[PDB]
Coordinates of C-alpha atoms in Angstrom, one line a residue:
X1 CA 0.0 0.0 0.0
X2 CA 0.7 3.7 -0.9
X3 CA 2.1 5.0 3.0
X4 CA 1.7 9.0 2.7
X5 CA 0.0 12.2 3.2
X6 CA -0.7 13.1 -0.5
X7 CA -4.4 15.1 -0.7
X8 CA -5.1 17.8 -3.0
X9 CA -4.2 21.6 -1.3
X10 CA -7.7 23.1 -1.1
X11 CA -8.0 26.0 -3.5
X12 CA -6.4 28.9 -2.3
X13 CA -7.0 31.7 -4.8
X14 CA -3.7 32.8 -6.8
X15 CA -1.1 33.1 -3.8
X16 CA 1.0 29.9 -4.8
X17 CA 3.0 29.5 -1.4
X18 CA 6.9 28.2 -2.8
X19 CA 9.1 26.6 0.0
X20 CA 12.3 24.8 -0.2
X21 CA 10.8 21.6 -0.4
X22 CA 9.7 22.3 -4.0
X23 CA 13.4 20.6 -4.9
X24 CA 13.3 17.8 -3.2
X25 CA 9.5 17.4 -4.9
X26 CA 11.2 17.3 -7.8
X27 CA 13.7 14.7 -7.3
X28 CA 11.2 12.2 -6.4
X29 CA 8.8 12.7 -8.9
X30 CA 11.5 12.2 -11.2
X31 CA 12.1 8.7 -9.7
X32 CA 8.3 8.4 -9.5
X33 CA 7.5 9.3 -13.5
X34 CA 10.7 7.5 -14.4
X35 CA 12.0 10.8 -16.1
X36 CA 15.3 13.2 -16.1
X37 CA 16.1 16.2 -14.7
X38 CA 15.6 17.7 -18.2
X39 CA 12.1 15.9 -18.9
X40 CA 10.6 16.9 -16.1
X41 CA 12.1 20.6 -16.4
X42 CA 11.3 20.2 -20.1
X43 CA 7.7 19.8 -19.2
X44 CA 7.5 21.9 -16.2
X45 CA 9.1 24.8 -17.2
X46 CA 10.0 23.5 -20.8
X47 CA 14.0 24.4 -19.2
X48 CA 17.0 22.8 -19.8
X49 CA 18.7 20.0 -17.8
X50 CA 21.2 22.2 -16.6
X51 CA 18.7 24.6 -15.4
X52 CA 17.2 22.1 -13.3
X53 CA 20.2 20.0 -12.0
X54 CA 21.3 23.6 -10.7
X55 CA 18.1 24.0 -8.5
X56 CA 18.7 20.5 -7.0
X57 CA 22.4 21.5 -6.4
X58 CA 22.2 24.8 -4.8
X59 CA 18.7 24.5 -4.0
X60 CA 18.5 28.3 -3.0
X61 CA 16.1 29.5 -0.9
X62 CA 12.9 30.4 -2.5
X63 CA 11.1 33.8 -2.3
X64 CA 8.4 36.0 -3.8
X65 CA 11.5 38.2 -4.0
X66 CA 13.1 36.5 -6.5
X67 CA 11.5 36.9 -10.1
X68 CA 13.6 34.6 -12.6
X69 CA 13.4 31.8 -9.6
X70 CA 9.8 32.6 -7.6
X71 CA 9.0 32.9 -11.2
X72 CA 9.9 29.9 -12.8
X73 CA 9.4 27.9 -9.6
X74 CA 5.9 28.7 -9.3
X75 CA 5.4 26.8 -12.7
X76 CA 7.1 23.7 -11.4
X77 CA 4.7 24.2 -8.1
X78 CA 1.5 23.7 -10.2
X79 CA 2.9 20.6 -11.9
X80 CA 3.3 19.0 -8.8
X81 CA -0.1 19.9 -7.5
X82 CA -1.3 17.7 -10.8
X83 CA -2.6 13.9 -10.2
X84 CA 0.1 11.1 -10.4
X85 CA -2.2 9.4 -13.5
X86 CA -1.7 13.2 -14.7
X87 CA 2.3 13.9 -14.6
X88 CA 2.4 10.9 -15.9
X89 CA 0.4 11.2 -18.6
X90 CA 2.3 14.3 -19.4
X91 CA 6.1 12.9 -19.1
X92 CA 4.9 9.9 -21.6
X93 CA 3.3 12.3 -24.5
X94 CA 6.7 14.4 -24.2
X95 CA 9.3 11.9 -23.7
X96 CA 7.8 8.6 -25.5
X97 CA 9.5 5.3 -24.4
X98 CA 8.7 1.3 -23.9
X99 CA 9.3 1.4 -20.3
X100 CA 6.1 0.6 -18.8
X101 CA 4.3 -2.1 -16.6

């Protein structure tokens, strides 16, 4: 069985709340859509690889002060929030392979 707190964050208007924890978000879900750091950047804020491996290395502290990251991370935040049958669905119509079962 699926252990884990996973419900959907009641709608809270447009103030998209971006913590830390966004990076380490997106490290698993690469693990869990069996995609790479440029996938998953490629189809959540259609970046390159090394535009996302960065975020996971520094992993900088996020703020509405910073545009080019609060930015760019708030794009990556609604991704997330998507169902699992939905990333999915999304990192397969990009990034086509066998791998499946």
């Amino acid at each position: 069985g699926s252990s884990g707190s996973s419900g959907p964050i009641k709608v809270d208007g447009a103030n998209i709340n971006i913590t830390a924890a966004i990076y380490d978000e997106i490290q698993q879900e690469m693990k869990r859509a069996k995609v790479s750091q440029a996938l998953f950047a490629k189809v959540a804020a259609n970046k390159s690889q090394g535009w996302l491996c960065e975020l996971l290395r520094w992993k900088e502290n996020p703020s509405p002060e910073n545009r080019t990251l609060w930015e760019n991370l708030c794009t990556i935040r609604r991704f997330l929030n998507l169902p699992q049958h939905e990333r999915d669905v999304i990192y397969e119509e990009e990034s086509s392979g066998p791998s499946s079962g």
